[PDB]
Amino acid sequence: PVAVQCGRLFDARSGQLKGPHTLLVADGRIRQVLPGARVVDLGDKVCLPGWTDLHVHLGSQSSPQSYSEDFRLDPVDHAFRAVGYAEKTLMAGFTSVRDLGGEVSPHLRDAINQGLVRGPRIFAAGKSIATTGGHADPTNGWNERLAHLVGAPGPAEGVVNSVDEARQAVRQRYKEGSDLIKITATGGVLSYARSGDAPQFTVDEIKAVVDTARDYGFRVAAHAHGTEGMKRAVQAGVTSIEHGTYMDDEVMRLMKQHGTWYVPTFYAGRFVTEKAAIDGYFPEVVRPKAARIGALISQTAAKAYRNGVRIAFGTDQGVGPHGDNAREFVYMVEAGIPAAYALQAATVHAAQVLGVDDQGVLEPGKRADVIALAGNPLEDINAVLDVRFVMKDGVIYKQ
Amino acid sequence: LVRGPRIFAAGKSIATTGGHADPTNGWNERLAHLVGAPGPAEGVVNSVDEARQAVRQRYKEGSDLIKITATGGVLSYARSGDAPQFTVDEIKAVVDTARDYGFRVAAHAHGTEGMKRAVQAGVTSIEHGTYMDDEVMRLMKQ
Amino acid sequence: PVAVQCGRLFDARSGQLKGPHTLLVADGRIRQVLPGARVVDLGDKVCLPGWTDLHVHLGSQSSPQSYSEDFRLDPVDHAFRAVGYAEKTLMAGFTSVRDLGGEVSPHLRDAINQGLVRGPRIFAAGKSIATTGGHADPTNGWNERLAHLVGAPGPAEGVVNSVDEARQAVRQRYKEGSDLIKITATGGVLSYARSGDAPQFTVDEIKAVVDTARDYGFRVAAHAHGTEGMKRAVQAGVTSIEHGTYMDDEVMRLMKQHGTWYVPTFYAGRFVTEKAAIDGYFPEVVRPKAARIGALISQTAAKAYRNGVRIAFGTDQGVGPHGDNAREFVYMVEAGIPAAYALQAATVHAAQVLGVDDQGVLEPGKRADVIALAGNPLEDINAVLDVRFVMKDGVIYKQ
Amino acid sequence: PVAVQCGRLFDARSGQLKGPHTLLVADGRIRQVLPGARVVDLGDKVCLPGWTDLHVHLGSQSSPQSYSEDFRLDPVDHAFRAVGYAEKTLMAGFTSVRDLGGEVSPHLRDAINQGLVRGPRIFAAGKSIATTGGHADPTNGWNERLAHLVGAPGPAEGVVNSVDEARQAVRQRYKEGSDLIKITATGGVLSYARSGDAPQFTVDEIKAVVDTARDYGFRVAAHAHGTEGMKRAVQAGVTSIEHGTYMDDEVMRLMKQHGTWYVPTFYAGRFVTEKAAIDGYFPEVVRPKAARIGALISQTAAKAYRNGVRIAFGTDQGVGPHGDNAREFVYMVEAGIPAAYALQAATVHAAQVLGVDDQGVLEPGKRADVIALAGNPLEDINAVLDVRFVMKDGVIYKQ
């Protein structure tokens, strides 16, 4: 039971910044909010709800040695790195994340929930579902010998080629403690494959995935660059679309009429655009796709925002360095999106994307996830780069 | 050889991947890798043809009837307890295959949706009926 | 470039407590000691070299649920616990440990060396070498189905039955990044096997293990309860003997003539004796062995010390809770061993056991592992339970 | 707390029949014997210690359908028969048995010890150790397809071909919960192999088996028909020899000097001789061996007894029907062995063969295994076929 006196409070529901306020917190919930036991004085700081990043990969981080780790490193090394990654993510002001791929994240979520390590609240997708040769196929680029001693990946490994295999893959993800489902509808940039945006799912397979996920209470996120795969994913009924690179007017209309959420991920596009100029950083098959696809996200996201498509906050950290997520906010404001909507997309719209109602706004009966900033972010957007106070579930982690 | 009652045996219970009767729930990655993904011979089905093969495999092993788990359960090492784990097509395939071999089908069900699917497919008995409601009651009576 | 000013200093080379001293720490080494840049002041505290624990298992900790973790838990789950275990071990005053079994410990050592997590300096053995049905056999207690699924373990898994297999197992431990070798010469208490002290190695096999390890520059530690297996291990040429449970005068003469080190591990025996009186804590096949064997270590260690057998500090944490290793000191003093020798066995004798010469004494040119206690340990031993200052390699971790 | 009053008592230590006696049974042991709480009255019956059968196979019983059960029956089907087999064996007067082969018998021993089923006290050997193509090879007679499916058996399956393999096989039998070791030194009758008495072990392999078993505290029993293999087994140091079919003067001298025990098994030879005259009962490869070898046991056992070879009681039930083991007594008497020695071989010599000292004679401080006969066995041996009172460990199972 504590009382946090905030000099200025940001309302995520209305998007407006209020004046001095007091928050009485008990049992990890916001017990009461008073306009105008232990006292926490942040009377010269701007208070906000904890941020949510809807696209992270806490089990990896890009480096020049990435494309060999799968042959040299064990999951235990990735877990030891993920401890520091999760600590840096929590200290940057993000009290919740959605992990969109990786088999160490559910274990890390269990460890954080038990109290062994510090970090955010993780909504884990587990292994991403793909087709043969797809963006998430775990055998792309392997020679004949390794592929022969591995075998052709199947539904247990996340690779499907029919409706029944898609059903089995969704059920296998449920068996392993996943919180949601992730599919790759088209090709990608960082995969060891020729194509970058070709459609890799049929409408029947995506419909089977969505129908199976509805039975287990799972939401489906879709990775899509090309227009045809994005259209198939939207018409099948996925909840969110990732990177939306080649989105057009018909896809925009379908998104608006369906209510699908859009996650642009400015940070990943800028990172892959900058890192493709360095010789030898990416493999020769990856570099042209990175150079071509990275420099379109800002334009596509600005066009989608101007047309009324619902946009939510997500960065794809795992390509960029963990702990620098808030820079995305800056990229959102220099692309023509107002700062208030940018903060709403990380606080109140992120909860709608996640399908929960116990977080997002500083209201009674909700989780006590509170952060504070030195400066007011509605005038200068760089103020989000200096987080002073972090509290999660009523426990103070930075003060 | 021994004393006891007259036994009508069902054998291994048919389930889906991660179901209440899945024999690999809660096993770590190593044991599950040396076991492999259970299939129709092990009682785990994910399609109509797999359900047909599972019913025929139970017949091959001298079963007297068929047992399926339509929803989740309590004592299983799985997260859910009543979520629907069978599609209507799979249960219909199970019942149609069992009718050919003279088998009756018993269904384990806690949640309402799985119970409704099992009843509308044509199972003989429903087990534990935990979240039964008025519509399921009417369907069972009819 | 720091200078630490201690009110009283302990000399591990001689076993006496000196007066005020100043130590100049630069580049991670002890540069120069002065009788009587930045200044650290511990003028009311007693300064000592950092302790070494020669028997730990940082990848496990005994609990009521232990004997099922082999079927329900993954290595990443163990690594997430090992992070906290290592943090507690380092914080308790132990800047160096010798891990005597486990496949996670080398990865934790690499992570600590890279700076990802905090912990002591680890000398890891990796997998322990045993025979078929031995104390360290990873398949003991499994049913026929699982045992057929995995197959009979061989030299790669650490199970040997001949001279060539022992050679290959030593080379396989070298291939996996081990710093030393560990064998189980007899049966044990916590294994799922019927015997507790029967001889499980032949002289030829142990000689082959020692001869192979000598080529690769390793030292061999042997776990031994029974007199025949321990005699075989001593006569083959192992470096240290663990738990010495049924040691007698012929064995004592052999160790005195051979120069073998002895590690009693009071804490493990006391812990198993206490836990054998709780119903259901241990399996039914384990409880009688624990009750019989636990209550003999104290007497055997005292009677070995009275005859002049060289004794080194070890606890077997992993059986007891990590971070409580200093309590072993108390068990050493109440058994008739002077506190000066108890501290020397953990500082200067531990370095001799490890085979290194860059640690153990606070002398110029050696690593700067310095701990400080509030009270004086040479009058009351319980003062070892309150560590106030911990420094390792020149970096302060507690002050 | 019971008192049993017997009209006449047999002294197994001396071989004489005493007069009336009273035995006080408390806590499962014989407490005190009186010449001349609850009272059990057997005043018109002869009291004896419970018998021991040193050669049984409680997991099988010979039948016309035997040589197909390896392909159509599961172990549970055998356990359900073993329940009744053990009940009949205990009810026939045998309170202790030594099982000389089978993977179900250790489980039956555990079940009887836990009290789930009724039966005698079992000393089980587990799998029998043989060489490639040996009498106990579990793959003899299979076609190429099945043999390729299972693969060539190794030490885990009980087949050895070298010293290290024999060591590993002994350790593997120890790992599976065996109480002793069993090897087949020569060929046999009931195996699906060409030979019946050829030497199938080398001296080095048997010496390795014996030396390994001595470390783990086991005794070794060797099945042997031919003189070369039996000589090798005797000179290596086995504890007992089974069936002794082609024993000669040199072998007899070797057993007399070494102190080896001899188990003739009259019943098995008589049964195979009787069943070799029925068409189709045995396979064509088995019938000539049975007809040749069965009709030599009686003569060999009698002529071995005349030379002073120590003889112990054994039948090989599993070949003949369980519960008819006492008939062997008759076969012993008509072959020239006195009834007193026949009873001593089953009571006091059996304990020496087993290596235990808590059974065999009705003396204070020993287990209370007491049987009673209606008639006097020292005048008519057929009285052993009518057992009226059976008690084991102080619990009355028949009265």
Ligand SMILES: N[C@@H](Cc1ccccc1)C(=O)O
């Ligand atoms: N994960 C994305 C990275 C990316 C995002 C956005 C733009 C460009 C690249 C991919 O590999 O396809």
Ligand SMILES: N[C@@H](Cc1ccccc1)C(=O)O
């Ligand atoms: N077998 C049932 C047990 C049960 C029956 C009825 C009610 C609750 C539990 C299950 O695990 O689901």
Ligand SMILES: N[C@@H](Cc1ccccc1)C(=O)O
């Ligand atoms: N590792 C030892 C534990 C132990 C140490 C000392 C005494 C008793 C037990 C064992 O299981 O055998």
Ligand SMILES: N[C@@H](Cc1ccccc1)C(=O)O
């Ligand atoms: N087990 C013996 C049976 C037997 C015993 C005695 C004489 C003849 C046969 C065998 O098959 O060889």
Ligand SMILES: [Zn+2]
């Ligand atoms: Zn993506």
Ligand SMILES: [Zn+2]
């Ligand atoms: Zn991604």
Ligand SMILES: [Zn+2]
């Ligand atoms: Zn049920």
Ligand SMILES: [Zn+2]
């Ligand atoms: Zn040990």
Ligand SMILES: [Zn+2]
């Ligand atoms: Zn140990």
Ligand SMILES: [Zn+2]
């Ligand atoms: Zn035999």
Ligand SMILES: [Zn+2]
């Ligand atoms: Zn036999």
